[PDB]
Amino acid sequence: KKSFKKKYKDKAIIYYEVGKFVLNYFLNNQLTQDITIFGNDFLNLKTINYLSLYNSKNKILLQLMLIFGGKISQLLSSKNLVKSLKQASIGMPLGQTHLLPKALSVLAKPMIFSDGYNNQNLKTATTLLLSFIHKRYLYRKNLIVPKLLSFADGNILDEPPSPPFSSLLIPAKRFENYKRFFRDTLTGDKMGQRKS
Amino acid sequence: PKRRRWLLNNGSWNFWFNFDKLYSEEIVTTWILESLIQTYKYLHKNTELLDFVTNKFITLGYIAPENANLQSELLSTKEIILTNSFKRF
Amino acid sequence: AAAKLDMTIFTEGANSRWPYGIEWLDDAYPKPYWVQQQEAEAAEAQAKQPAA
Amino acid sequence: HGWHWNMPFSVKTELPDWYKKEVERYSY
Amino acid sequence: TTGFGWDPDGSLRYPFKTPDLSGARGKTWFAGTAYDAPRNADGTFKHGWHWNMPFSVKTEL
Amino acid sequence: ELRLDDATLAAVSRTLMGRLDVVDLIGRNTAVEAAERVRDALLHPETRERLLAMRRWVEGGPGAPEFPPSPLSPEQTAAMSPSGPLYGNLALNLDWWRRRQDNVISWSAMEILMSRRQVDLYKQDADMTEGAIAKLGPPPA
Amino acid sequence: RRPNGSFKEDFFGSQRDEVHEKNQVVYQLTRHAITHYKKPFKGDYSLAIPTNLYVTDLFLKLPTQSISNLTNVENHNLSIKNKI
Amino acid sequence: PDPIPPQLRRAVSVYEAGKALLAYITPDYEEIARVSVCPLNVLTGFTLFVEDEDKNVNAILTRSELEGRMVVHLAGRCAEKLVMGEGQMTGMGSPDLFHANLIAREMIMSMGMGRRTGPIDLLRVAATSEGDPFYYHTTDMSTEQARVALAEVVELLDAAEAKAMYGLAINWRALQALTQALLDRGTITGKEVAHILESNGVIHFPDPY
Amino acid sequence: TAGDGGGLVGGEGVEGSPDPIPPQLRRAVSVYEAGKALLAYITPDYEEIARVSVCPLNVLTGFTLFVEDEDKNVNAILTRSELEGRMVVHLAGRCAEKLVMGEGQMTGMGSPDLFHANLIAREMIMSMGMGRRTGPIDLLRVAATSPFYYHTTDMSTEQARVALAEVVELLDAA
Amino acid sequence: SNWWASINRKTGIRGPDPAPAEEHTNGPARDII
Amino acid sequence: TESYPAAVANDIIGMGSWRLKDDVDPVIEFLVARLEGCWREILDTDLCLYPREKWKEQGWDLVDSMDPHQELEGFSYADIPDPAKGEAGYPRLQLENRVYC
Amino acid sequence: LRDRYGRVELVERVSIQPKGRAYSRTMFQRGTDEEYQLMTRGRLLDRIRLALAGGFAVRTALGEETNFTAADIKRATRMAKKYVFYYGFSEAGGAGITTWANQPYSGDFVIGQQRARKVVSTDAMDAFADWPTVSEDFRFDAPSPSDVTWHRYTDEVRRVLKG
């Protein structure tokens, strides 16, 4: 029992890093066609600013390849268990009882042990791409017009400042009843309650 | 304190401004898929190298997931091994 | 004639009723109740005056 | 044949014309 | 800068005035119907996509 | 030909809908939808009998039959025991159990988590303009 | 930094300054904000030029996103923040 | 005597029976420590699971484990719906509903397990400065993206409900025995519920891995 | 550079900043600065150029040193001709980079200059009443600070539409 | 000539001289540093 | 840190990354895994891959009958569904090779 | 204006000698305190016109817009709001009574100062007609308008300024 579970876990863990380093080495020492070198894989904020503000699109695509090599390697090496789970026994996709057993194995996602992504990789990827879009105004320069300018959406129209500036206590007195209303009607006191 | 910037709820749901979220999202999704596809297309032609390097890495040693309770970079034996495997396969 | 302004005034004239000259107001807001009442009384006024 | 687990999808929206004018003004 | 600007067709204004499903590319999973994935001018899928990849693609219409 | 009296109607309804004298507090549309569901829950006895048994166990009178009947015949229950041809299906993903496959997603949340009948019945209680409400349900408009 | 604010003449009506002084302040402020960007000793570590603030937000913070389409929130996905 | 009416005791007992049954037959779940229905006539019911210090939170969460937890959470509502009928379902199974929806949103918007959204990151758990231990960091989405994500969340929850219904329907005798034990005894521990379930032919879910 | 941020200087060695400033990234700064100085030279009544530099102190921008006259607008005057000229000069660099190095290989180097131009167009419409359909009325407020926001407005949405359309067409003319 | 008459922001802005799109790249690592 | 002998490693790998697995009978899976395991474990200090221009550029590492010209770049095992009886193609043939020196 | 209705005062002394903080000055002759207890409608209209006059004169002489307008409209806009909301002189609604208004607060709330200056020409002298709020538990603030009412109210302000 534990033997097979450990086999699956270990296979996934090993194939991850094997693919990660294989892609690192390839991109650094073989696309260039003196000394063999390796990367360090960490993207600072300084590095993200530099890459997104001064490099072209192909450079950013190379960085993303570096990020996703490990997951793709895990993908290329996993056994799809649907075949054996439906063979050794035989409205929902498991209700169809016909369709030659090969064309039946595509009605839903394959049963791969290691599914989903790691959250650090996703954070890095989306931050890099969001910087490229929002800070480097190419192909759309008119979207700078709504920059550091508010439009007063949800609030009281004219409100004076508060004690740190003005010794006036009416806005805070109303804010306290606002919070009472929130707790008693909308949210509750802990995540999961219908009300207070 | 209500919201006062209603702009459209006839074929979508929009509020004043936002113009800039469809462009952003389609760009992000397109670029991520292109990168993943290039990675897949490269690793798809080098499966033997993957099998070999994996065999070697297993027999060298690795930190089991449950033994470790409390690999960003490669050691030096593993670097010799990776360079050789790239030269052979 | 150069001493004139072109400051646009939105709710001027025909634009003094429900849309108030906003083109997109009917795609964002349901029509209020008093606005429907005003439309009703105005319609009956200008639709019995052809008989009056 | 039958379905495939990886079929393309689509989202249907109907925007008015003033909205398309607005989004084409800031698309430059 | 009075008199300068862009015309609605795109031109500057100074102050005064189908895919080919012929060969094997036509035998893919749905290949012609409305459920097919968007293609290029030569018959390849959009971003080099293939029905193997782990994420779906969005149809234009 | 089916014969139905007050008691069976009351029991079926109280199992399927709840208290039976709040038709005004919940609107006539909710009541009409519930009536459609109840009418469909009759018109074949394999469900009607189970509903009556559940009702009589809940009320807990003298004839509480110690439990309601199971939803599955004792045949499919064996065809899914470990010595069965369908045991493996209990191990597939949650992607093999989904009862709905939609390839066009609508701009409205009402059309995603409701049935077409429910939408055509309920869409008049929405907080949208008339031009929006006229875009939901049967395209007849 | 040892310890302008217009919120006094909006809500508290203080208005203890002559009209010519207020006008002069306004003139100098517009000219300073617009034409002293990137000028030696005159346009410097100054918080009255919006472009300096844009630059610091462009090289220090992460990309800021637009407002949301939810209700009961302020403009972004958050509630009103404390007054004091 | 009994301060509590009959039908309330029945409803709470069926809820706890369903939840304990499905937490028992699910591979790799925690072990039940106690199951009580209105102890000391205090109007309440619960199902404690034994807390251990062996669980290392650094280990990742597979997809199978998350789906199993979702099913365990929908179990009690499904048991009520199956035994007593829709019109008698109360709102007592609300925290389980909240946690099921939380898991289903995190699988789609935070781990990229949805085939249509892709590997985009839109949620971020975060811990408070020490109410609750945690809150989230969200992202402003458009209507297109939000609808595409809602479709998948709804599919996941519907499939989880169906699997829970089947896992309960094929164990009807064990469910009956357990709810009768709860209706007459009021409180059970882990060993006793394990024994009651084994002596009635309980059917465990497989584990493909 | 003040924290984990950074991204502007270009000669320190660390990951963010390369050592010799690649030549493809120096040609672009030369094009940017050439366009900006050429536009500032052919505009009548603009300030006068004292020095034009490329990557001073290794920063990844240009720099042009303008000397002006304090006996013409005595730290207080701002006509309309001056403002329009400044807008044109600040957009010149972006336009030259796009015209020479292709529309796809542009960089973020001119991203602050862009915001400066926009800012002028904002003040000309919402704060000085040089707008035609908006007329002479004051709209903006400075949010008292210490998502960052510098201005604030509470005009209705139907007036915000018009004001922003005017800002956009000013920028397009420039 | 008068190429500056046929400048069109819809179909792309471009100059007369032939697209100096020359470029090169070492690895991502030897380009970060 | 834990290690494993070579036999256990090549047993964990199995039919490692063959692109046509999931279609192979378990007996053929077992035999291929064992044979390639002995190759990788015994000859490991000199095992190379056969030169790529001799077999792998002609497209002979994965051959499909429904696509004899490789206009799907070797994903024909996934893009093209199986032809039904009597259609032009029945029966489909797939081959996968591995060659070492 | 003094020679058409008779509300404005008389000019006293014009100067463009930079002196103090300003570069130019224009002084008026103050009337008795009886004049400054009230604020009628005509007097406020005249104050608005006087606020606009400076920038519009520079523009009509120089032939070109400047930033001088910037300092006028600001002042003017403030007064115009007070003309429409607080005092209720306009025609917003058929009479001039709107559903919302912003009454000032006393200067005690601020963290004040002290200087050796006299009272400002008008803006601190015409602040004698306000009656600010002093106690906090008797303050009234109607519910804010609804961005379709706000449209019409700000449009009334615009009409006043344009006239």
* F112 and H151 Cβ atoms separated by less than 8 Å: yes
* B17 and A146 Cβ atoms separated by less than 8 Å: yes
Q: Minimal CA–CA distance to H9: which of H162, H157, H180, H144?
A: H180
Pairing of strands K62-64, K94-96: antiparallel
Q: Please answer yes or no on whether E12 and J10 come within 8 Å at the CB atom.
A: no
Tell me the β-bridge partners of H94.
none
Tokens of J25: 């790249």
Pairing of strands D10-12, F104-106: parallel
What's the CA dihedral at H191, H195, H201, H207 to 10 degrees? 20
Residues of I in contact with A52 (CB under 8 A): 108
K81: DSSP letter: P
Q: Helix, strand, or coil here: B35?
A: helix
**Chain I interface with A: residues with Cβ < 8 Å:** 4-8, 14-17, 25, 60, 94, 103-109, 111, 114-115, 118, 122, 140, 143-144, 148-154, 160, 164, 167-168, 171
- Alpha-carbon distance of H28 to H49, in angstroms, equals 13
Round the CA-based radius of gyration of chain B to a whole number and report it: 25
- Alpha-carbon distance of E44 to E20, in angstroms, equals 9
Residues of I in contact with A146 (CB under 8 A): 164
* Active-site residue list of I: 33
Q: Please answer yes or no on whether J13 and I15 come within 8 Å at the CB atom.
A: no
- Alpha-carbon distance of E39 to K79, in angstroms, equals 14
Round the CA-based radius of gyration of chain K to a whole number and report it: 17
> Between chain D and chain F, how many beta carbons pairs sit less than 8 Å apart?
21
Which positions 50-109 of H are in contact with B (Cβ < 8 Å)? 56, 58-59
Q: Please answer yes or no on whether E10 and J8 come within 8 Å at the CB atom.
A: yes
> Between chain B and chain L, how many beta carbons pairs sit less than 8 Å apart?
6
- Alpha-carbon distance of G49 to E42, in angstroms, equals 54
Instruction: Judge whether E55 is closer than 8 Å to chain H, CB to CB.
Output: yes
CB atoms within 10 A of CB L34: 7
Q: Minimal CA–CA distance to L154: which of C7, F31, K63?
A: C7
Q: Helix, strand, or coil here: A78?
A: coil
* A60 and B31 Cβ atoms separated by less than 8 Å: yes
Tell me the β-bridge partners of L14.
L26
Q: Minimal CA–CA distance to H75: which of H160, H147, H142, H7?
A: H160
Q: Minimal CA–CA distance to I117: which of I88, I96, I145?
A: I88
Which positions 1-28 of D are in contact with F (Cβ < 8 Å)? 3, 5, 7-14
Residue C15 makes CB contacts below 8 A (sequence gap 6+) with C21
Longest dimension (CA), chain F: 58
- Alpha-carbon distance of A41 to A39, in angstroms, equals 6
At residue I51, φ and ψ (nearest 5 deg) are -170, 135
H/E element holding L28? strand L25-28
Method: cryo-EM
Instruction: Judge whether B11 is closer than 8 Å to chain F, CB to CB.
Output: yes
CB atoms within 10 A of CB A66: 24
Q: Helix, strand, or coil here: L72?
A: helix
Half-sphere exposure of A5 (CA within 13 A, CB side): 10
Pairing of strands H32-37, F104-106: unpaired
Residues of L in contact with G16 (CB under 8 A): 113, 115, 117, 120, 124
Q: Which chains touch C (3 or more CB pairs under 8 A)?
A: B, D, F, I, L
| Resolution for the entry shown, Å | 2.9
CA distances from A192 to A195, A196, H96, K40, K79 (A): 9, 10, 8, 56, 46
Tokens of K24: 């192979």
Instruction: Judge whether K79 is closer than 8 Å to chain A, CB to CB.
Output: no
Which of A5, A81, A123 is opposite residue H121, by nearest beta carbon?
A123
Tokens of I66: 């303008």
Q: Which chains touch I (3 or more CB pairs under 8 A)?
A: A, B, C, D, E, G, J, L
CA distances from L52 to G14, H155, L43 (A): 22, 64, 15
* A162 and A172 Cβ atoms separated by less than 8 Å: yes
Chain centroid offset of residue C39 CA: 10
Q: How far does F103 lie from chain B, in Å, by closest CA?
A: 19
- Alpha-carbon distance of D19 to D23, in angstroms, equals 6
Q: How far does H29 lie from chain E, in Å, by closest CA?
A: 29
- Alpha-carbon distance of G46 to A17, in angstroms, equals 49
Instruction: Judge whether B28 is closer than 8 Å to chain H, CB to CB.
Output: yes
Residues of A in contact with D4 (CB under 8 A): 106-107
- Alpha-carbon distance of L8 to L30, in angstroms, equals 10
Tokens of A190: 């802990």
Question: Omega of the bond prior to K91 within 30 degrees of 0, cis?
Answer: yes
Tell me the β-bridge partners of L27.
L13
At residue I152, φ and ψ (nearest 5 deg) are -155, 145
Burial readout F105-118 (b: 16 or more C-beta within 10 A, e: otherwise): bbbbebbbebeeee
Residues of I in contact with L154 (CB under 8 A): 155-156, 159
Long-range contacts of F32-36 (CB under 8 A, 24+ apart): F32/F121, F33/F117, F33/F118, F33/F121, F33/F122, F36/F117
Q: Helix, strand, or coil here: F19?
A: coil
Long-range contacts of I153-157 (CB under 8 A, 24+ apart): I153/A149, I153/A150, I153/A151, I153/A152, I153/I126, I154/A152, I154/A157, I154/L150, I155/L154, I156/L147, I156/L148, I156/L150, I156/L151, I156/L154, I157/B4, I157/B5, I157/B7, I157/B16, I157/L147
Burial readout B20-48 (b: 16 or more C-beta within 10 A, e: otherwise): bbbbbbeebbebbbbbbbbbbbbbbebbb
Q: Please answer yes or no on whether C6 and I133 come within 8 Å at the CB atom.
A: yes
Q: Helix, strand, or coil here: H138?
A: coil
- Alpha-carbon distance of F111 to F118, in angstroms, equals 9
Instruction: Judge whether H3 is closer than 8 Å to chain F, CB to CB.
Output: no
At residue L2, φ and ψ (nearest 5 deg) are -55, -30
Q: Minimal CA–CA distance to L161: which of L40, L67, L52?
A: L52
Which of D8, D9, D13 is opposite residue F107, by nearest beta carbon?
D13
At residue L15, φ and ψ (nearest 5 deg) are -155, 140
Tokens of A13: 């863990």
Instruction: Judge whether B41 is closer than 8 Å to chain E, CB to CB.
Output: yes
What are the strands, taking DSSP E only, across chain F? 104-106
* H150 and H106 Cβ atoms separated by less than 8 Å: no
Q: Minimal CA–CA distance to A26: which of J27, B48, B36, B32?
A: J27
**Helix boundaries (H) for chain H:** 6-24, 63-83, 94-109, 143-169, 172-185, 190-198
First to last CA, chain K: 33
Q: Helix, strand, or coil here: B60?
A: helix
Tell me the β-bridge partners of H134.
H127
Amino acid at E61: L
CB atoms within 10 A of CB F139: 7
Q: What is the DSSP string of chain G?
A: -----THHHHHS----S-HHHHHHHHHHHHHHHHH-TT-TTSSSS-TT-HHHHHHHHHHTSPPPP---S-SSSSSSSS-PPP--
Tokens of H117: 């959204």
Instruction: Judge whether B3 is closer than 8 Å to chain L, CB to CB.
Output: no
- Alpha-carbon distance of H207 to F109, in angstroms, equals 36
* G11 and A160 Cβ atoms separated by less than 8 Å: yes
Residue L109 makes CB contacts below 8 A (sequence gap 6+) with A160, A166, A167, A168, G12
* L109 and A161 Cβ atoms separated by less than 8 Å: no
Q: How far does E50 lie from chain K, in Å, by closest CA?
A: 7
Burial readout I107-141 (b: 16 or more C-beta within 10 A, e: otherwise): bbbbbbbbbbbbbbbbbbbbbbbbbeebbbbbbbe
CB atoms within 10 A of CB H156: 26
